Amino acid sequence: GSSGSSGKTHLCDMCGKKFKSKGTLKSHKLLHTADG
């Protein structure tokens, strides 16, 4: 996970996926928190 650039577009530094809305990025983020 590399810290990206402060961009409105909800960007995921965990994998590198960009989203327009939050709810979308959220559900996608939860997936990352699997092992932990």
Pairwise CA distance, residues 11 & 23, whole Å: 13
Instruction: Tell me: is residue 25 an annotated ligand-binding position.
Output: no
By CB under 5 A, residue 14 contacts Zn ion: yes
Instruction: Tell me: is residue 15 an annotated ligand-binding position.
Output: yes
3-state SS, residue 30: helix
Binding residue (CB under 5 A) for Zn ion from 4, 15, 22, 24: 15
Min dist. Cβ of residue 10 to Zn ion (A): 10
Contact (CB, 8 A) for 12 and 28 = yes
Contact residues toward Zn ion (CB under 5 A) are 12, 14-15, 17
